DNA sequence: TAACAGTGGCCTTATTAAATGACTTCTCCATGATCTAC
């Protein structure tokens, strides 16, 4: 298998093509081939460089960790109410948590999950694709649930600044920091 | 040897709390089809 079946599966050595790649039996690989569905993809935006003046081009990638085909196929179906306007986010952390904010919390369940987000970026400017550049790894618990979505509740919600042609989604600093 | 040990009234009035411009520049790609040599 190459990098597009398996994230971060890439060949180091060029030169050993033939030998130096991942190997996966068949029916894992038809797992891999139907990876995309699950995860989800968030936009990245370094708050250094103004929005206006460049638009986003890191993508984070947020991928679950499985307890259950069902509770993650609903996770999923559930995920899909959200705007498109919420995929923006300004940490590793906010696009974790976003994946779960729409989470129902049973005062009665212990609750508990965890998701690793990818981060992929260009290295140059002039780069042809982007790079996976780090892999955060985020567990959460009740309490971070239930103060994550009352953070979102309470605070601003992603501007939707529109030009000519262009929808440049304004973030919010203080609930990626939070 | 004594009796005092200051009685008053004020404790800043203005005014301005920055003016510019810059907010990285390069490079290091991965992978398969094809060319080619043994």
């Not at 369940?109 to 790079?131: G, H, I």
Request: a positive charge; hydrophobic letters at 35%.
């Amino acid at each position: 298998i190459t990098s597009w079946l398996y994230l971060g599966g890439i060949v180091r050595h060029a030169r050993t093509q033939n030998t130096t790649k991942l190997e996966e039996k068949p029916e894992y690989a038809l797992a891999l081939l139907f990876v995309p569905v699950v995860c989800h993809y968030c936009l990245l935006h370094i708050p250094s460089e103004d929005l206006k003046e460049r638009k986003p081009h890191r993508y984070l990638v947020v991928i679950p960790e499985i307890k259950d085909f069902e509770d993650a196929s609903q996770r999923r179906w559930r995920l899909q109410q959200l705007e498109t306007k919420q995929f923006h986010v300004s940490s590793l952390g906010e696009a974790g948590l976003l994946y779960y904010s729409l989470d129902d919390i049973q005062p009665e369940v212990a609750y508990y999950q965890a998701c690793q987000v990818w981060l992929y970026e260009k290295t140059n400017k002039a780069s042809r694709q982007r790079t996976l550049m780090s892999i955060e790894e985020i567990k959460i618990d009740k309490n971070i649930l239930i103060t994550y979505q009352q953070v979102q509740k309470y605070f601003k919600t992603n501007y939707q600044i529109i030009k000519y042609k262009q929808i440049f989604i304004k973030v919010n600093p203080i609930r990626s920091l939070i």
